[PDB]
């Protein structure tokens, strides 16, 4: 698990900057967000933003590190239903019986 970010490229990450760069939270240009290799799901421009903020106007800001937390835990993605005992874990995405 990794915590915060800064700048170099933003790919396969969270919904944070998803608003900073309207293209993917207003329209659907995140697939065109790549600058040039097209004519010839997460990913961003070469490098455009620096920290954890809100950009109506750079208001909620916070410039800081990026932690690499090693939490020894077992991360399941697509758990399924086993109903012998009480339905443990979870389902694919719908119900959350946890």
């Amino acid at each position: 698990r990794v915590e915060y970010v800064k700048k170099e490229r933003a790919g396969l990450r969270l919904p944070l900057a998803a608003w900073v760069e309207k293209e993917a939270y207003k329209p659907g240009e995140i697939l065109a967000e790549l600058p040039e290799p097209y004519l010839f799901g997460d990913k961003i421009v070469a490098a455009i933003d620096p920290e954890e903020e809100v950009i109506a106007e750079a208001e909620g800001v916070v410039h800081l590190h990026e932690p690499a937390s090693i939490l020894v835990v077992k991360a399941r993605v697509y758990p399924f239903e086993d109903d012998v005992e009480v339905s443990t874990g979870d389902r694919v995405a719908p119900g959350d019986v946890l």
């Binding site: 915060y4 954890e52 909620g60 800001v61 916070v62 800081l64 590190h65 719908p94 959350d96 019986v97």
Partner: protein, 345 residues
């Protein structure tokens, strides 16, 4: 083994394990603390369950089981059925709604760490409001009573750091804790202050004259409504109570206590008086015409000692009427057989 070295060691470790980043992680847990309230206030807008409920069932799901709701507080809530059924309603919430609970949980969770972290900040301040009348651990304790108090009030949206915001609250806590638990006898904060100035001026007074000021000088110096009467009155209360138990005279076995007499009790020559009084008064109380005698026997005698609201239904005139005549007729048959003459009382 000798306390505090542990209670300090207890968080130097944890803190020493997780000192939350000055901005980042304080902001992290900060943000994850407001969306808590937001969430819960909204859950309530859907569950009908009072904010207390939603706020109480999310804590018991994270920090402690049924056990926590049973001992700290009695059984108003069923260990099983109550809580479980409350949370049972949070799962029934649609995706959109079950969304906040998942937040409410992680949030309270966030409230945990943030507080645990700044536990070193407490003792720091606490390291100064030391000499007053509050144990050091106690000081720390009511000190946390202002820190966690901060957690509710903070506004991460307002960019000012946390550490410094807790400062105020914390110091506020310790201060009330000083005005409350420091003495055996309780005095108001108003008089509390009124005592410092009154002791703070004595200082500049010791400074010159040489004479430990008369209640006149100290009175002038202080200000407006300060009369010599007041200061002599305001200092008696200043002094701290004296031990009922203290080495008296030639400090040996003789304990200060035997030196204070008793009173509520009728020392024999008082009980002996009741038996004569009571038996004699009641006697003369039998050679009178029931009425007035009784209403005045029961009036001054029984309930609580208003000639008007005196007798049952007869007017004031027949009240006084038989009164001054009966009472007085009473006095002159007793004076004869001198029973009550010698003022027993």
């Amino acid at each position: 083994k000798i306390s505090t070295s542990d209670p300090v060691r207890q968080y130097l470790h944890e803190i020493g394990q997780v000192p939350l980043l000055t901005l980042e992680e304080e902001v992290e847990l900060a943000r994850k603390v407001e969306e808590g309230m937001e969430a819960i206030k909204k859950l309530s807008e859907i569950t009908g369950l009072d904010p207390d409920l939603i706020r109480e069932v999310v804590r018991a799901k994270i920090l402690g089981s049924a056990r926590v709701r049973h001992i700290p507080g009695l059984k108003e809530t069923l260990d099983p059925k109550t809580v479980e059924e409350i949370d049972q309603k949070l799962k029934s919430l649609p995706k959109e709604h079950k969304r906040y609970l998942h937040i409410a949980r992680e949030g309270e969770a966030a409230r945990q760490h943030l507080i645990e972290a700044n536990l070193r900040l407490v003792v720091s301040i606490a390291k100064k409001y030391t000499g007053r009348g509050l144990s050091f651990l106690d000081l720390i304790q009511e000190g946390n009573q202002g820190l966690i108090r901060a957690v509710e009030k903070f506004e991460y949206k307002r960019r000012f750091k946390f550490s410094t915001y807790a400062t105020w609250w914390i110091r506020q806590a310790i201060n009330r804790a000083i005005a409350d638990q420091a003495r055996t006898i309780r005095i108001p904060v108003h008089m509390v202050e009124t005592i410092n100035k009154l002791s703070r001026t004595a200082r500049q007074l010791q400074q010159e004259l040489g004479r430990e000021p008369t209640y006149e000088e100290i009175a002038e110096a202080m200000g407006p409504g300060w009369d010599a009467k007041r200061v002599e009155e305001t200092l008696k209360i200043a002094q701290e109570p004296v031990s009922l138990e203290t080495p008296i005279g030639d400090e040996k076995d003789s304990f200060y206590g035997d030196f204070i007499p008793d009173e509520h009790l009728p020392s024999p020559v008082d009980a002996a008086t009741q038996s004569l009084l009571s038996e004699e008064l009641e006697k003369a109380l039998s050679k009178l015409s029931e009425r007035e005698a009784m209403v005045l026997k029961l009036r001054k005698g029984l309930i609580d000692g208003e000639e008007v609201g005196a007798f049952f239904g007869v007017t004031r005139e027949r009240i006084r009427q038989i009164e001054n005549k009966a009472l007085r007729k009473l006095k002159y048959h007793e004076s004869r057989t001198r029973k009550l003459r010698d003022f027993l009382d």
